Design a protein around this nucleic acid. Structure first.
Ligand SMILES: [Mg+2]
Ligand SMILES: [Mg+2]
Ligand SMILES: [Mg+2]
Ligand SMILES: [Mg+2]
Ligand SMILES: [Mg+2]
Ligand SMILES: [Mg+2]
Ligand SMILES: [Mg+2]
Ligand SMILES: [Mg+2]
Ligand SMILES: [Mg+2]
Ligand SMILES: [Mg+2]
Ligand SMILES: [Mg+2]
Ligand SMILES: [Mg+2]
Ligand SMILES: [Mg+2]
Ligand SMILES: [Mg+2]
Ligand SMILES: [Mg+2]
Ligand SMILES: [Mg+2]
Ligand SMILES: [Mg+2]
Ligand SMILES: [Mg+2]
Ligand SMILES: [Mg+2]
Ligand SMILES: [Mg+2]
Ligand SMILES: [Mg+2]
Ligand SMILES: [Mg+2]
Ligand SMILES: [Mg+2]
Ligand SMILES: [Mg+2]
Ligand SMILES: [Mg+2]
Ligand SMILES: [Mg+2]
Ligand SMILES: [Mg+2]
Ligand SMILES: [Mg+2]
Ligand SMILES: [Mg+2]
Ligand SMILES: [Mg+2]
Ligand SMILES: [Mg+2]
Ligand SMILES: [Mg+2]
Ligand SMILES: [Mg+2]
Ligand SMILES: [Mg+2]
Ligand SMILES: [Mg+2]
Ligand SMILES: [Mg+2]
Ligand SMILES: [Mg+2]
Ligand SMILES: [Mg+2]
Ligand SMILES: [Mg+2]
Ligand SMILES: [Mg+2]
Ligand SMILES: [Mg+2]
Ligand SMILES: [Mg+2]
Ligand SMILES: [Mg+2]
Ligand SMILES: [Mg+2]
Ligand SMILES: [Mg+2]
Ligand SMILES: [Mg+2]
Ligand SMILES: [Mg+2]
Ligand SMILES: [Mg+2]
Ligand SMILES: [Mg+2]
Ligand SMILES: [Mg+2]
Ligand SMILES: [Mg+2]
Ligand SMILES: [Mg+2]
Ligand SMILES: [Mg+2]
Ligand SMILES: [Mg+2]
Ligand SMILES: [Mg+2]
Ligand SMILES: [Mg+2]
Ligand SMILES: [Mg+2]
Ligand SMILES: [Zn+2]
Lengths: 91, 69, 120, 114, 50
RNA sequence: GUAGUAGCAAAUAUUCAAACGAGAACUUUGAAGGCCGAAGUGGAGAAGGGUUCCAUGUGAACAGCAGUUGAACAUGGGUCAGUCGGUCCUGAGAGAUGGGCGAGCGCCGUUCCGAAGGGACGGGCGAUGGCCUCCGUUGCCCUCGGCCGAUCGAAAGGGAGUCGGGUUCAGAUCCCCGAAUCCGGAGUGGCGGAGAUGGGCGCCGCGAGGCGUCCAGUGCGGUAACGCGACCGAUCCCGGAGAAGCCGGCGGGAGCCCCGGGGAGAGUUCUCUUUUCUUUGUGAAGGGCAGGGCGCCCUGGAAUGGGUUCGCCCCGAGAGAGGGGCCCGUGCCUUGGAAAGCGUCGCGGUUCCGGCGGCGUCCGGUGAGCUCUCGCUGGCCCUUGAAAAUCCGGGGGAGAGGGUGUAAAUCUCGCGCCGGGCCGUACCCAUAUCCGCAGCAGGUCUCCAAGGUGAACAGCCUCUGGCAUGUUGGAACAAUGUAGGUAAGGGAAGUCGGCAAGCCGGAUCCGUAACUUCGGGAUAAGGAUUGGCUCUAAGGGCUGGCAGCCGACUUAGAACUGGUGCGGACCAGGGGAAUCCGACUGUUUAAUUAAAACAAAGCAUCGCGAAGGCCCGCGGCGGGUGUUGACGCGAUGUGAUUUCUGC
RNA sequence: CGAAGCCAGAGGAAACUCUGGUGGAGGUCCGUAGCGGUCCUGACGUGCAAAUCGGUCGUCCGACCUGGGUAUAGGGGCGAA
């Protein structure tokens, strides 16, 4: 049921720590706790270890990704550039 | 300790040297023979008094016999 | 002690004026949810372990035990006797139509077989 | 009810002093010292956490006593690989070595007609 | 610990002695366990290849 | 002088009789009345104390009264090991040579500016001695040997392996008896059993057979998971174990509790009570089987998707199902094991006597019960939660061995033999063995923990186990006091201030605003019930060809009853309306203050790309930050949030 | 007290909402052991004591509490000041 109608996951800190702080942690407590869809084992057991490490349950293949999310805006863009500077006519 | 399952196996164990004592303990339904040889206590549990006495007469004479209490 | 405790299991000494903790502390909610849902979730097996209720109604009724629908074993036992009648009513009315499907499939086959025999 | 007392002089609840208790033949409840768990050897590559099968599982200093069947498995890569990685190191060492030969005779043909 | 970055641990082969060497790179983004990091002068330009 | 004065007042307590004794409010025994009440006034230790332990003897000291007593004095006793521990190992660190510095004792420094391995097996030659067959000892020679630097550092970390019973005035896993094991060592190499004797041919023999020839033998079984009593192998290489946080749930096992029955002894019997209490066992080690765990294998492929947890999760990267394998077994039975132990009944023996004897040491049930252990499984972390001595396995193949009716290189298999040095070991471990000047209501690190009430290890009262009111007793019942309790009527009028007291409390059913960062407030406020007994209603478990036996303690309902009494003692939130300060949790002025003071997350500002920022330094380009690199270090102001940041 | 996930019923065309459950996150809340020491401006004040005792209190899964080991020493150490 819609128990807490605005805060969602940040019903654990409760009364305190300021309004706009909890608004700005809610977006990023969700992101590190979700079960991301693994690109290798096909399953959704992507779970992070300690910060910057991501880990899938089946096939047990450990990938360094973002610090809170799995990817980064930097991560896709540098992957975009590095293939593009690779296929630039022999390196 | 260890347990024996053939009377031949225990009789050969009685022939084994580095052994000094055999304890015949008359329990009610069965009777056990116990060699105190070395590092072990070899027990053979047998059901008959007649098998007991003819095992007693098969006992090696250098090995001491003591019937318990 | 035993004399006075024999009175308690009768239901004496256990009103409102001798309880001093919460009823959630005396026999907790989760422990009552464990027991009742181990009562139920093994009866639903022993039905499908024989021919009683099919594989498909089980997992439909399994999750419906996992939700708050059935209060105890009794109304679950009444509810399955409700269900296996309605499977019987669907299958009783279906098979007479399906046999009546069969008589007209085969009569149009027998109009096929006899007329074409006269066509040669 | 017979409240029971340590047999050694380690009165602190330490890691090594981690016990069970048994019942003597004098009807006295004694406090008997438990050897710790011998956790089994797990396998190489670390693809799976989970111990290797068929190995009697004791302390490393115990292992001088056991026989050389209660420490490994009859297979090649006996007590070290998890028996799924053995039958993957077979398939991987075969299928790559075929590709050595194919590329060597493909590039022999690159040195042939070119 | 004491670093917020993750920390890679790359295996090799010593070209002079029959021995495998275990060295510790810094885990750049996107690498996963089981990658063939190829390092040297004429390394082909991908992620992780120094 | 003060003066026979203050004083011997913290934590409920003594009583009667009897013995020894010059001599008894205290010593001893016995009975009653008691309290500590399992977070103990109990059972044992680490630290420290060092003879305090035990026994006997005296009563001048000392024990704040006394003493016939002692932790006093005097005399004499007691502290036993391969498996209990120190030793060994590394952790934070502490520390010599090389080197640097220094007037200098020396400091810096720990791999730094270094010829920092003295070992190896094998080849070789040379010598040597035994039984010069062959071995055994060195000389030097070809080959490897990151020597990643010595060495110290834990009586709580790492660390192979001991149990059960008895014994003393005093010790015990240490002595005795009985039963186990680990680690080393074994020339002429102790004894089996494996590697071990298979096949082809011929010659003859009815065969049994033998003879010769030649070849092969570094083991076997299962499709697999892996299995067995053994299973050639160096330098070197790979890995595992040692080797990991914290908190939840839950399941398995054990201890203790609890229910019924037997049996043994005792408790009451005024009346009842098939009653009430005590007691009712199997060690290490070896083997068998329960039970649990698996992300182990095979068959085979499911959508109408199913399988399952309290919660998930699970799967075409192969589910349910059918059938195996491994690992754990602290559970039960078995060898030990009933000959001991224990209960109770007898009988000797002046005695020593681990006397002798008869009997019993059983049947079950139940669980969110508590503790402990093993395991599953998940949550949290800008928190990812130790090294090493040692030990094992695997991959490789340097060589090594036997030549046949010859048995060798071998061996983690089953036994046999020998040893295991050195130090520590009594006691108190505390309202009387420590420290606080002392037998000081303080201080000091843990393990074990029953019955009743009850949510509970709260508090209250009992058992086992302890004690004797805490450095005194007798008489009386003034003032003052310190604690403690009530008070007609009024209810802050008292005082600087409701200070202190006193209300309210536990529970179920009711009912809940202003205000808000939508989380709250909030157990708001305000209410109603509560006992006793006599019942009903509902919640289950194991077998079946829709029944029958047996099980846990809760939840609602109703009657009747008491003098409207019922959380009947203990146990236990007064409440609102608001103003100022601080976001909160945290911390601080040990001994005059806990605050608004400090910190705090948030917001900013600044330095610095390393021949550098900030710092230490008596010294060297010695050091810390730095096992670092602008999402970082170093330096400050401000102090949650929201809205604002003028000149 | 009941954060996320989660089931089940109900309404909707979508977006999803509404209701009963399950779940057990926190520098949570009432509290014990432990650790602190607000108040009575109480006892005590040639005391039990060169800072105690009794009531009443604060926090009590957390920046916790504590034993042993090691480091830093006098214009020096250390400090949530
Ligand atoms: Mg709940
Ligand atoms: Mg006087
Ligand atoms: Mg006076
Ligand atoms: Mg007398
Ligand atoms: Mg006298
Ligand atoms: Mg009391
Ligand atoms: Mg005590
Ligand atoms: Mg004494
Ligand atoms: Mg005397
Ligand atoms: Mg005196
Ligand atoms: Mg003396
Ligand atoms: Mg001994
Ligand atoms: Mg020098
Ligand atoms: Mg130095
Ligand atoms: Mg050392
Ligand atoms: Mg230790
Ligand atoms: Mg040991
Ligand atoms: Mg003793
Ligand atoms: Mg003994
Ligand atoms: Mg040996
Ligand atoms: Mg259990
Ligand atoms: Mg055993
Ligand atoms: Mg039970
Ligand atoms: Mg002692
Ligand atoms: Mg004291
Ligand atoms: Mg004290
Ligand atoms: Mg305890
Ligand atoms: Mg208790
Ligand atoms: Mg109760
Ligand atoms: Mg007395
Ligand atoms: Mg007295
Ligand atoms: Mg005293
Ligand atoms: Mg006193
Ligand atoms: Mg009055
Ligand atoms: Mg009045
Ligand atoms: Mg009034
Ligand atoms: Mg007024
Ligand atoms: Mg005034
Ligand atoms: Mg007050
Ligand atoms: Mg009153
Ligand atoms: Mg309020
Ligand atoms: Mg104002
Ligand atoms: Mg504050
Ligand atoms: Mg103060
Ligand atoms: Mg601000
Ligand atoms: Mg510098
Ligand atoms: Mg603006
Ligand atoms: Mg709080
Ligand atoms: Mg509150
Ligand atoms: Mg609190
Ligand atoms: Mg309170
Ligand atoms: Mg105080
Ligand atoms: Mg005062
Ligand atoms: Mg005074
Ligand atoms: Mg307190
Ligand atoms: Mg000075
Ligand atoms: Mg501080
Ligand atoms: Zn994956």
């Amino acid at each position: 049921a819609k128990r807490t109608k605005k805060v969602g996951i940040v019903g654990k800190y409760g009364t305190r720590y300021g309004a706009s702080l909890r608004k700005m942690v809610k977006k990023i407590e969700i992101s590190q706790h979700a079960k991301y869809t693994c690109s290798f084992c096909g399953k959704t057991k992507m779970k992070r270890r300690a910060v910057g490490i991501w880990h899938c349950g089946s096939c047990m293949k450990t990938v360094a990704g973002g610090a809170w999310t799995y990817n980064t805006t930097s991560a896709v863009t540098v992957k975009s550039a590095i293939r593009r500077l690779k296929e630039l006519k022999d390196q | 300790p260890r347990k024996i399952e053939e009377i031949k196996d225990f009789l050969l164990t009685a022939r084994r040297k580095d052994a000094k004592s055999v304890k015949i303990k008359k329990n009610k339904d069965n009777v056990k023979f116990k060699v105190r040889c070395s590092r072990y206590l070899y027990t053979l549990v047998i059901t008959d008094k007649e098998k007991a006495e003819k095992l007693k007469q098969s006992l090696p004479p250098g090995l001491a016999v003591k019937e318990l209490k | 002690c035993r004399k006075n405790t024999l009175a308690r299991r009768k239901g004496r000494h256990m009103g409102i004026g001798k309880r001093k903790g919460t009823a959630n502390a005396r026999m907790p909610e989760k422990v009552t949810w464990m027991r009742r849902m181990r009562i139920l979730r093994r009866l639903l097996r022993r039905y499908r372990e024989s021919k009683k209720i099919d594989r498909h109604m089980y997992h439909s009724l399994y999750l419906k035990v996992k939700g708050n629908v059935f209060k105890n074993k009794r109304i679950l036992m009444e509810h399955i006797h409700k269900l296996k009648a309605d499977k019987a009513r669907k299958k009783l009315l279906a098979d007479q139509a399906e046999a009546r499907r069969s008589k007209t499939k085969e009569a149009r086959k027998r109009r096929e077989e006899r007329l074409q025999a006269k066509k040669e | 009810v017979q409240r029971l007392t340590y047999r050694r002089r380690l009165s602190y609840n330490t890691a090594s002093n981690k016990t069970r208790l048994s019942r003597t033949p004098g009807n006295r409840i004694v406090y008997l010292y438990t050897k710790k768990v011998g956790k089994a050897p797990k396998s190489a590559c670390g693809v799976c956490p989970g111990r290797l099968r068929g190995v009697r599982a004791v302390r490393p200093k115990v292992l001088m006593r056991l026989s050389k069947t209660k420490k490994h498995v009859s297979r090649a890569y006996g007590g070290s690989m998890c028996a799924k990685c053995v039958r993957d190191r077979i398939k991987r060492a075969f299928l790559i070595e075929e590709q050595k030969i194919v590329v060597k005779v493909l590039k022999a043909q690159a040195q042939s007609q070119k | 610990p004491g670093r917020g970055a993750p920390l890679a641990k790359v295996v090799f082969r010593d070209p002079y002695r029959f021995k495998k060497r275990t060295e510790l790179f810094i885990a750049a983004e996107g690498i996963h366990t089981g990658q063939f990091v190829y390092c040297g002068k004429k390394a082909q330009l991908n992620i992780g290849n120094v």
